[PDB]
Amino acid sequence: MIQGVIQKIAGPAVIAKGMLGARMYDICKVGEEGLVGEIIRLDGDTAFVQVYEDTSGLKVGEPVVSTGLPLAVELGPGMLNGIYDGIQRPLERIREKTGIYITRGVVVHALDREKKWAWTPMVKPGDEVRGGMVLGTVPEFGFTHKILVPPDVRGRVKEVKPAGEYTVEEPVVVLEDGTELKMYHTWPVRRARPVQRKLDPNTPFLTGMRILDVLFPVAMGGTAAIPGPFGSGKTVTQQSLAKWSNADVVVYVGCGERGNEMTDVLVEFPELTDPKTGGPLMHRTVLIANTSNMPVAAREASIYVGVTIAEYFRDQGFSVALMADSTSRWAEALREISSRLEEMPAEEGYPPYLAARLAAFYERAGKVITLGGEEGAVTIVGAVSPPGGDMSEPVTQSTLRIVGAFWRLDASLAFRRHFPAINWNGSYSLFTSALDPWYRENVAEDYPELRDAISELLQREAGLQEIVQLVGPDALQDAERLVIEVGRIIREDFLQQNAYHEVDAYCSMKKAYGIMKMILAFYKEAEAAIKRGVSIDEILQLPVLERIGRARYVSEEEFPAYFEEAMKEIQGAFKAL
Template sequence: MGKLLEVNGPLVRARLPQVPNGEQVRIGTLGLVGEVIGREGQEALIQVYEGTESVRPGEEVEALGHPLSVELGPGLLGQVFDGIQRPLGRLLEVSGDRISRGIQIQGLEQARVWRFQPNPQLAAGMAVTGGVCLGAVPETPTIEHRILVPPGLSGELLELAPEGEYRLSDVIARLDTGEHCSQALMLSHRWPVRNPRPYQQREHGVSPLMTGQRILDTFFPLLKGGKAAVPGPFGAGKTMVQQQIARWSNADIVIYVGCGERGNELVEVLDSFPELTDPHTGRSLMERTLLVANTSNMPVVAREASLYVGVTLGEYYRDQGYDVVIVADSTSRWAEALREVAGRLGQMPVEEGYPAYLASRLAAFYERAGRVQTLGGSVGSVTLIGAVSPPGGDFSEPVTSHTKEIVRTFWALSKDLADARHYPAVSWRESFSDDIPVAARWWAEHIDKHWQAGRAEAMTLLTQAEELSRIVNLVGPEALSGTQRWILEGATLIKEGLLQQSALDPVDSFCAPEKQFVLLDLMLQIYHQGVELLERGVPVQELVGLPVLARARRCKSDYKNTQVEKIQDFAKEIKEAFGRLGREHTEAGRIPG
């Protein structure tokens, strides 16, 4: 037990001899939660995860004997936690609409009973190590929760509980860890959030994370186990892009971390997610989703912890062999929390006031993504997607520039596209993906071998159209040839018929990979057929005026994911329309037959 010496906003100083860095403490009569982040002789510097108003020097400080940790076990999915894993639903029951300080609520409901099915391959007397599956619990109708031996434990299995109903605190197994010392294992265990959970080895990514968003999946794919950033200025649609990824991605588990964003945006997430149907299972999306909410009006230091809480929960499900996607909105607010704490500590500021260790902290966070062979021998992945909010849309600011060097996929949002009501406002000029060769192998095996060539041609067409648009802005469209005007029309077809996608459209909010490729192929077929007629002398004005072009732009919303054949039938109609136009000019003697 120690004494509080000084209070400086979320940082306090206390006399706590022999308490190591990283240990959790409780402060004052309110019992505020804090973490030791520095030591000077007999004194400890503590960051407090709750407001320190009315806390005064002289109050007692109690060391808890463990670092900031989360409770891992059945009951996580479907929950909404704050930045230090307190369930907001139960906080509402205890404290009402405003969270009282010092409330102590465990992350998981201890009284709930779970049906445990032991692993039939295990028996007493067998040697087990960390990561071995002791059995399973049906956490939701969608997800089987595998109960693992915690990392770092190993020994002889003395007993394994039979099938039955157990609470989290009930013993389901005992290990002889040596020297006649037994270790009881329960359905849950704790893990420090700042320590990455161990694994056997990293594996290369082999399949893309399919988000149902064409600009992401078709043009800038992200592999499962990869790391991506979504930078963009205010109003460009970062939160909506991330919500779409959380809603529709083909990961097994989705973790949405609202880190320092506006409360109304998180309220929208909390209201909409329980109403959504998972396109992959047909059941409620919340059966494979959990949320970590730390809004901008919550204590700033808890914002810094919330990302680590989210990624630790993701690693836990990865260790069970699941593919997990973690959406962090936003890492800029997390970096601002680092900056504020560093300023109060008197640390030397560097770029724009951020601490010198900003780049290393960002890299360490994103490094926790990956596809791995787990301790238990299965393969799981954590995919990290972080939003970045550069002030004024300046991508050269420190958080964005450092993040760009770390990630392999960069989905840059454009204010100009957002102002033009082009959503998702992902810029095809500034975005990139380093995973295209691997994604191409997946597309060739599962969808179509021409995906990479079609994507490259579409990107070339968009680039040519950008150059021609600058000429039009200078001297007008009359300066362009018919072929150049058709390039502009082809690029417009790709932008409006393929890249634009409304999150509110009941048909087009999610686009399956098969439909994505058919739409891409349709737009390229139209462009090729137009080029052939232009070469035969058909005026570009007549091509642009064909009614089927307007219908082509609407295909994305007119046909569902299960109606790919109808899009292919429509492609035949377009071919016939172009053929009729060519025959009309041939019969009129205006172009050679």
Template sequence: MKEGRIKKVSGPVIIADQMEGTEMYEVVKVGEMGLFGEVIELEGDEATIQCYEETSGVAPGEKVERTGSPLSVELGPGLINSIFDGIQRPLNKIREKGGNFIPRGIDVSSLDEEKKWEFKPKVNEGDEVEALSVLGIVPETKVIDHKVMVPPETEGKVTEIREGEFTVNETIAKLELDDGETKEIKLKQEWPVRQSRPVEEKLEPSTPLLTGQRILDTFFPITKGGTAAVPGGFGTGKTVLQHQISKWADADVIIFIGCGERGNEMAEVLEDFPELEDPRTGESLMERTILVANTSNMPVAARESSIYTGITLAEYYRDMGYDVALQADSTSRWAEALREISGRLEEMPGEEGYPAYLASRLAGFYERAGMVKPTEQRKGSVSVVGAVSPPGGDFSEPVTQNTLRIVKVFWALSTELKDRRHFPAIDWLESYSLYTDDVEEWWDQEVEKDWYDLRERSLELLQQEDELQEVVQLVGPDALPEKERVILNVTKMLREDFLQQNAFHEVDTYCEPHKQIEMLDIILDYYDIASEAVDEGVSVEELNQLEVVDRIARMKEIPEEEFEEKAEDIRKQMEEEINSLEEE
């Protein structure tokens, strides 16, 4: 294939000439070191290339070698339990081959090409198969069966199917296509990262993605196949929240993208995840996790591709029928990479220097989430939670605003709550979820209580508290009527005993749905009974001194297996103590 020549170097942007016949988004190898790059603009015989590696030392006149294919990921057994960089190079293999620092131009296969995988066929010779039909199963980890599928947009008759142990490059089946040609199927396939994988049908989301975090599940739920944004200033807990979702979400596969974040945060993920016991299986959490790492000290252009690499891997496991939860930390760093590349391309800047196409790029990423039917036989989902890091915690900046136009769940992290040591520091007055109507039926079927009513009543009380605080700051709480002081006491319970959750507490780190609703119901029952008692002449000070108030505060520390019995006991004690006050 014809080679071009470097004409100009500007940081990660290379301009090369003599590139006739080159296509947009084609991968090239730049310079004598063979640095990876991607064509992002064409004009005449000149191509503009964004290079995924440090370009220092690259000089005009050096060759640019075309590959003829777009930036793609390798899909096959061995993805789970791996950590890749932004262009799907396995970091552990790079370390074995080149040491602790990534050598420029190193070319390593994304999948282990020597390891043999046990393949168990699910079809027979002579069977007619369509796109994404399952040909067989490979036990990828102890908890994930890798379903080897017919490539998209391919259908035909199985003329040969093999059983046994194979490497990812060996043929496991042959198909006779409609035009009479024979297509060989291997365990490994490739797919361009910027192109979403085709599906039969996109479904309306109806099942919540349970995280075990009370403020998320009960107040601002996300569905399987949903999208959520987590904006927050420095130190408000974006990464810890995403770690919690990764650990506890009831998804089959977890994909965590560290996009431009600090290296120590990614190192913490690498150290913690292998040691964490998966509550679903009892195995290591890494047995169903893929990590994509492009930290802040890695090349900026690869940061832009890391988002697409992660979502393409998520779509692949979705097509197998799995529920995938993808965490992107953070899309602001990705947008900054877009801004830097755009600046070097001398494009007309938009708001705050971001490119004019920022909104469409964000939409293109989030819209690849969803609950879908890859084929008529099965369904799967990709749920996307994207962290946003607005400078100075300013939610009016372009990345946050453009993200909010796309996603349906907004978990607003508050610096004020963080300063008060309230975690998760999600502001219940600013946050919202547009999935509440979609998941109401699920909650009605799963729990005996009216989830929607409990949620609405709680949020209404918290809103009233916010209004009362203005009066309290002027004249103090003692000047309020007794009924309104009861509201302040109950909202304090909601804030401290329900919404506040300790990620490092053995029991409180995860709260299952029935326990969440029961806790909320007990607090609201206390409000109803206490309000009636105040009408009977009982003072708020007397109510505050009841022993049951301390028991309500410690409800979240009760283990799940003991909770039902102790919850009933708390209810009885609450009624007895308040009734005795009324009688006095």
């Protein structure tokens, strides 16, 4: 490596001297704790180390060395249902060796080196490959796990061992170019694997949560933010999103969060049962969690790990979930490193790197097409936390640029408890001019109007409320008061939802389209009805609205059972009017 030692210390930072010809940003084992730092500044013989391992009582003179390589992941199977924290280290083992805490400086391998796996070579000796193709599969859960050749690695094949039980350790395929391709390989995180070309959106991505999807859906590539103050769902809706999918694997970060904040999250997972495999849903999930008593800077590392996993799996044909918990952390991180390198921070105190890197973080995801001609798409859904509790800080506001659509939340709804608290006079979508193909393909064409035809309602709900509280609903007439309880239903059976209800736990387009016709009716009937000299009082009392008020209950199977059931009752009861 290179030898040298310490020079001065400042909290998470330390400077080091005598190192020279050293590389830029590396695995820097520092101290006899051996702390993996990173060279941010390279100045003369004087190296800034930058730990991700909590400091305490170092001195001056301890050895400092460095690989001369950045930071990358052991790849292979065994990933699902694993822990890796932010610095890749797998808590599993740690948990065991270190009692009951987290203790810095304890080092282990990441991915296991003892586990056996059946091997099916899909390659033969003397063959020729290309960088990113598959060499062989491995049975992992309900998955065709594959060993994708690393980038810029190709050539003839010297041998191929036949089937067997192995650890990822051995090369099964040594190239006829003298290249022993072991299963895992090294791909530095701060970069992205390329793809043969990129495939593009036109396919909906559903987490199935009603309103969320139905009003402002997102596509399967895409990008979106979540912001709002503490309280409305942010911290925990995401958990819930995981419990359903329109995707395969589920890769979950977490940063700066507290242990209790992710407890259940872990342990419940085996009871969750995906229905797209029927599996116990922990089998396709990833713990990349981070405490909140790590170095500020380890909330950098942590983020990058996720996404770099995502591609790997995605190139293995898959639909990937990344659900970024709080960029605020990350922010703060860099905000701290600043102090160290002493830079005039841009307004509100941040480095003006800011959205530099952010920008790229969003890009990398999406649906693509690989060398292997496989599909897979990365979906990302990021959360934010500005102090005041809204757009009023650049770190949130500029986040709104490099993105697709966003999912606003606000305090006020959180008080009266409407989970989620989306301000539906908030957010926008940016795909609903291109999700219609798949729409009138599964629902049927009468979704592409009628949905919109719900919107008009709440548009017009706004415009009147204003005056309602300014005078009273009283000096307003029937048709006015119409929409008032239209809107009402749009909340009663949408906005108000739970993620605790065994029933509304998962919901779908059928229920969607379902109530999408239900409501329609009242309108269309009543519009004529109140012009039958009828008073809206009475129309409010017509119990059939009350019936639809049980809408969130029909467990979604026997859903057209009750659809059609009450369908008639509408055209029944109202034939009096």
